[PDB]
Design a protein around this ligand. Structure first.
Ligand SMILES: [Zn+2]
Ligand SMILES: [Zn+2]
Ligand SMILES: [Zn+2]
Ligand SMILES: [Zn+2]
Lengths: 381, 381
C-alpha cells in the first residue's frame, strides 16, 4: 500500500543511526524517528501497512554503476553473446538502481538496444540509467554524438565503458580522450547529470597515463574521469590509489570470489584502502553483471553482497564499506535522491539479517523481495 | 512537506464525490475519504501539513495538449517570434501538465529547442511532454524520424501540430499522412505513449477529408487522428462532430474574447455538443498558449479557465465540462496517472472559489499558488 511504516530498524544510512521507525509515503522516505517504547495512533481512514523488523539492519539499496543489462560477451564468437539480465538478478542481489552499458561488443549491439532495456527495467519498477558510447572510438550512439545523447536522452548520464590500456581498445589518443571528456562534462552541466566518462581499464602497462595527463595538462575537473576494474592487476591498483589524491572516484569490480586474476579480490583492495587512510568516499564497487570476464567466466550482481560479507568477515565495520555500494556512487553520478536513508530521498532500501544476507528489498517504495520471498518477477523470468 | 492533508473539499474528480478529505503523499494521492468532523489524530513524529478548505471546490489540474512552450509566431517577420512562456503562465491558469509543440515556424525553431524547454519546465516542477514534427513535411525531428523520436525520447508522445487544410501546410498527400500515422501509432505501441497525430486544421474547404479517408480505407484506429482547432469555422465544426462517431477525439481551441471570428467560441461549441448528445468524453479543449492567432492575436493558458466560466454561466454543470480539460485529455494521451482525483494518481489539483476562480494550484504534490498568492515562479519571471 502507499504508506508503509517500518518499525524497529537498525539503520545504516549508510551512517549508523541506531534503532528507528521509518515512514515511507509513495516512493519517498517521509520520516525517521526514534523507536518509541509503545505504539502510535494511526488515523483509521489512512491505509498504512505496519511492519516490525525486530531490530534488523536497514540499508540503502545498492547502486550498480556497471551492468551489462543487455548481456555482454561476444568476445569468443557469436554464440558467446549473453542474454538480457532479468529483473530479479538485480533486485535479489539488493540492486535498486542500475546503470547499463555496452562493452567490447559495441558492433552487433546498439545504444538503441541498451536504452530500450533501460526503459524495460523502469516499467518493471527498477530505477535504471545508462552510459552511451561503449569501448570503441568513434562512439556507438543514438543521435550521432555523446553530447546529443546525454543532452536529449534522459536516462543517459555519461560515456561508458570506454576502453584504455587494453588490447581491445581503439588505441585512443589523448586528444580523442579529452574531447570525449569535454562532451560528457559540458552535457552534465547542461543537464545536471553525472557528465563523467567511465573508463574500462585493461592490463596495459600505460595504466592511467591518459587520465593523469588530462588532469595535469587541462582544466577538466578530476571527477570527470572515472576508471573501473582498478583492482584487476596490482600495478594498476597502486596507480589508482595514487589517482585518488587528484579528486577522482575509482571503481572496483567485485570479481566472483577466487577469480581476481593476478589483481586483488575487491575485499582485499578495500581493506588495503582502509589501512592506507585513502579517501574512502571516492571508492565505489560495481558487479559487472551480465559481462564475461576473459581468461569465459560470468559477472553477476550477487557478487556485491558477497564482497560486502567478505569485508565484514575481516573485521571491517558495515559503515566503513557500505558507502562504496550506496552513497559514494550516488555522489559521483549525481543521483541526488539515492544512496542514503534520509527524509526526502527515494525509498530504495534493503533489510538484512545477522548473517548480512538480504531478506527484504524495496525500490521506489514497492517491495520486490520480502521475508526472503520474491514478490516481483520480470516479464519473462 | 512530504504528507499534506486537504480537509473539507468539494471534489469533482471530475465526477462529483461531494465533501472529502484528501491525503497527499509525496507526488501522489494516497487517501480520499468522507470528511466528517471531530478529531483527526496524527502522530507527532509524522510531518503532515493540515489545511482546511471550508467546502471549496477541488478539481484535477488542467492538462493543455497544445502549447507553444518555446513561443510560436514568426509568421509576419522575424520580430514576431514569441518569447518562451513563463512557468506561471501555465500554473496561475491551472495547467499542471503541458504538451508543447512547434507550429508554422519549424524552420528557425527546432525539436531540440522544444525538448530543452520540456526539460526546463520539468526542472521547475511542471509535468511537460511534447509533440515532435510541426506543421511541415518532411518532419522537424531530433533523430531523423518520428518513429525514433517517439521511441527514444521519453517526453515525446506523438506528432503535432501537423497542418492539413491550410494555406501554410505542406500540401501533404494521403500516402504521406497515413505513413506518418503508422509511425506514431506503432511507436505508441512500443512505448505505451499516446501514439497519436495532432493535426492543425486550417480553413480549407477540404477540411477533414484525409482523416475520413484514412479511417475508412486503412486499418489505422480512429483514435490515432486527433484534429484541433475544430471550432475555427462552422462547416469544420459540423464535420468534426460527425467524426466523433468514428471514435476520434477532437480538440477545441479556447480562443480568447470575441476572436472565434467566423467559427464558434469554445463555450458555444461545447454547449452545442451537450445539446446534441454527442459523446463528450471524446472532446478536449486546449489553449494554444504562446501561439500567434493571425487573421493577429496571442494564445494564453488562462483562456482555459475563462472558457470554463463562460460554460458554467450558460447553465452547464461542472462535471460535464471539466473532463474536457482533464480526464478526456489524459485518456487520449495515455497519461494513466493524470486527469483524475483518485488514489494512486499524481497529486495535480486546483482549488476554486464559488465564482470558479482558481485560488490554489498543486503540481506533483507541491503548491505553486496558495490562497491567491504565487508560491513558485519560473527561473526568469
Ligand atoms: Zn570492462
Ligand atoms: Zn564490463
Ligand atoms: Zn494550429
Ligand atoms: Zn497552434
Amino acid at each position: 500500500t502507499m504508506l508503509i511504516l517500518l518499525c524497529n530498524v537498525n539503520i545504516y544510512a549508510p551512517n549508523p543511526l541506531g534503532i528507528k521507525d521509518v515512514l515511507i509515503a509513495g516512493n519517498k522516505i517521509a520520516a525517521i524517528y526514534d523507536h518509541g517504547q509503545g505504539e502510535i495512533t494511526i488515523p483509521k481512514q489512512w491505509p498504512v501497512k505496519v511492519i516490525n523488523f525486530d531490530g534488523a539492519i536497514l540499508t540503502p539499496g545498492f547502486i550498480d554503476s556497471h551492468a551489462h543489462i543487455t548481456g555482454g560477451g561476444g568476445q569468443a564468437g557469436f554464440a558467446t553473446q549473453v542474454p538480457p539480465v532479468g529483473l530479479t538478478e538485480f533486485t535479489h542481489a539488493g540492486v535498486t538502481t542500475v546503470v547499463g552499458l555496452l562493452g567490447t561488443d559495441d558492433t552487433t549491439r546498439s545504444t538503441e538496444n541498451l536504452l530500450s532495456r533501460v526503459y524495460g527495467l523502469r516499467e518493471e519498477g527498477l530505477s535504471a540509467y545508462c552510459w552511451t558510447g561503449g569501448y570503441h572510438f568513434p562512439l556507438t550512439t543514438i543521435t550521432g554524438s555523446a553530447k546529443s545523447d546525454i543532452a536529449f536522452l534522459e536516462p543517459v548520464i555519461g560515456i561508458g565503458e570506454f576502453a584504455i590500456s587494453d588490447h581491445r581498445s581503439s588505441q585512443p589518443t589523448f586528444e580523442e580522450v579529452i574531447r570525449l571528456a569535454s562532451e560528457t562534462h559540458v552535457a552534465g552541466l547542461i543537464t545536471g547529470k553525472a557528465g563523467v566518462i567511465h573508463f574500462h581499464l585493461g592490463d596495459g602497462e600505460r595504466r592511467l597515463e591518459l587520465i593523469e595527463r588530462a588532469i595535469r595538462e587541462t582544466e577538466l575537473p578530476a571527477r570527470v574521469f572515472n576508471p573501473t576494474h582498478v583492482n584487476r592487476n596490482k600495478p594498476l591498483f597502486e596507480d589508482s590509489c595514487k589517482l585518488l589524491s587528484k579528486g577522482c572516484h575509482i571503481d572496483l569490480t567485485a570479481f566472483p570470489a577466487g577469480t581476481a586474476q593476478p589483481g586483488w579480490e575487491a575485499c582485499d583492495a578495500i581493506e588495503m584502502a582502509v589501512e592506507r587512510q585513502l579517501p574512502l568516499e571516492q571508492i565505489t564497487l560495481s558487479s559487472d553483471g551480465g559481462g564475461c570476464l576473459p581468461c569465459m567466466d560470468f559477472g553477476r550482481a550477487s557478487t556485491l553482497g558477497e564482497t560486502l560479507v567478505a569485508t565484514l568477515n575481516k573485521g571491517l565495520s558495515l559503515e566503513t564499506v557500505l558507502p562504496m555500494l550506496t552513497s559514494n556512487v550516488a555522489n559521483i553520478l549525481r543521483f541526488k535522491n539515492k544512496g542514503q536513508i534520509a527524509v526526502g530521498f527515494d525509498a530504495d532500501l534493503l533489510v538484512m539479517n545477522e548473517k548480512y544476507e538480504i531478506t527484504d528489498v524495496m525500490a521506489q517504495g514497492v517491495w520486490h523481495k520480502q521475508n526472503n520471498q520474491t514478490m516481483i518477477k520480470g516479464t519473462f523470468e
